[PDB]
Amino acid sequence: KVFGRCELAAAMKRHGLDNYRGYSLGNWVCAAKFESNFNTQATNRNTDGSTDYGILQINSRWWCNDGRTPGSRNLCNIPCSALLSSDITASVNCAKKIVSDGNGMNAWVAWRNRCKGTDVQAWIRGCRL
């Protein structure tokens, strides 16, 4: 499922991400856009042999089990295939853990390189919260 810009903001605000650890909604919407293009089914194999899964491209090295990442933690206790659901719940609850683990949204390279320090307000422009 490829969400719309305003559609994903709503599901995101609802599952409790707006101001989560002091990151406003636009930051999460911007990260989704540059990670997955809002596609819940997005996967990207990394040179390291891990894979990033879903709307927030959560990585198999640390966070989820895809049964093929050689040496790999499963912090979030889920198979990576539950990050590809059209319901973003599982992606969201894993994202709260990730963002809580010290580095905040720097965990998402696409956030640090493209969203950090820009007007992320514009990403929720014309959406009903």
Chain positions contacting ligand [N], by CB under 6 A? 1, 11, 14-15, 37-38, 40-41, 86-89
Per the annotation, the verdict on 52 as an active-site residue is: yes
In degrees to the nearest 10, what's the CA dihedral of 80, 2, 15, 72?
Answer: 20
> Is 48 a known ligand-binding residue?
no
Helices 5-14 and 25-36, axial angle in degrees (round to 10): 130
Minimal distance, residue 125 CB to Pt ion, in Å: 13
Pairing of strands 43-45, 51-53: antiparallel
Look-up of token digits 């007007």: 119
Question: Which of 7, 52, 66, 87 is flagged as catalytic?
Answer: 52
Per the annotation, the verdict on 35 as an active-site residue is: yes
The item of ligand [N], Pt ion, none sharing an interface with residue 101, based on CB under 5 to 8 Å by kind, is none
Residue list for the binding site: 101
Residue list for the binding site for substrate: 101
